[PDB]
Design a binder for this molecule. Structure first.
Ligand SMILES: Cc1ccc(S(=O)(=O)NC(=O)Nc2ccc(S(N)(=O)=O)nc2)cc1
Ligand SMILES: [Zn+2]
Length: 257
């Protein structure tokens, strides 16, 4: 019964998930002047050409577009990563207003939303094992700002009416996640966690510098989703973001000067 409300929100999570106050929690503020360029960081390799999307699910906190991760079909490699990480799902976090919604912040700036492409390290065999490892996951984070529409997002937006409430899913095949990527793959990277319960400290975060633009109409449709199940009182799925957590003993590295 954790959530994003007054009585079950991020400030309450530590009672069920003590790791909420751990040493490598996410998200964080990215202080751009303190992040250090790391010349040894390899270029990021995003290989989504063979992606097989399957389904879209409202899980009561966000919506997940799920992929077939039983073969190396859509993988993330390079950058700070050792080995091959398979795409399992993507989802977003967003606000009730355009001035908030992202989890990561940049010099304390909040974006309207944040896209998370979640990948797991193939050396651990499946997602459940990977989340128990400090290098188990790689999440590619992409900021959304409100401006021009993102054409590649529209197919997602248009199916949302069919998964309005918690527990609803719909077929979502042949979706190409390359249409959600910005031009540049310049990034910041640091060791962190899942940003929702169970908050496991198993994530290498790769957060892209360049946001994508989405239209006001696109984000408004995100905000029509429901946290609640069908036949329960309507509570709009908005402000499903965790705020910035203490950086503690971590350095954020940049791939770019
Ligand atoms: C092993 C296992 C653990 C947790 C789940 S889950 O579906 O209940 N939770 C989960 O997937 N959490 C999660 C949390 C945060 C993020 S995030 N927001 O950091 O990208 N992605 C996924 C499933 C299998
Ligand atoms: Zn997320």
């Amino acid at each position: 019964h954790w959530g994003y409300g007054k009585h079950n929100g991020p400030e309450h999570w530590h009672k069920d998930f003590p790791i909420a106050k751990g040493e490598r929690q996410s998200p964080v503020d990215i202080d751009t002047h303190t992040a250090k360029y790391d010349p040894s960081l390899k270029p990021l390799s995003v290989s989504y050409d063979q992606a097989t999307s399957l389904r879209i699910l409202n899980n009561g906190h966000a919506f997940n577009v799920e992929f077939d991760d039983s073969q190396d079909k859509a993988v993330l490699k390079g950058g700070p990563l050792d080995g091959t990480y398979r795409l399992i799902q993507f989802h977003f976090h967003w606000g009730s207003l355009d001035g908030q919604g992202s989890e990561h912040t940049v010099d304390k700036k909040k974006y309207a939303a944040e896209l998370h492409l979640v990948h797991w390290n193939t050396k651990y065999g499946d997602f459940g094992k990977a989340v128990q490892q400090p290098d188990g996951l790689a999440v590619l984070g992409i900021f959304l700002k409100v401006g021009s529409a993102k054409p590649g997002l529209q197919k997602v937006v248009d199916v949302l009416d069919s998964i309005k409430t918690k527990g609803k899913s719909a077929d979502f095949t042949n979706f190409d996640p390359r249409g959600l990527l910005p031009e540049s793959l310049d990034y910041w990277t640091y060791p962190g966690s899942l940003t929702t319960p169970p908050l496991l400290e198993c994530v290498t975060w790769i957060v892209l510098k360049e946001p994508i633009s989405v239209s006001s109409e696109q984000v408004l449709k995100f905000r029509k989703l429901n946290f609640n199940g069908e036949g329960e009182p309507e509570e709009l799925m908005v402000d499903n973001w965790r705020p910035a957590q203490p950086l503690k003993n971590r350095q954020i590295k940049a791939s770019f000067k």
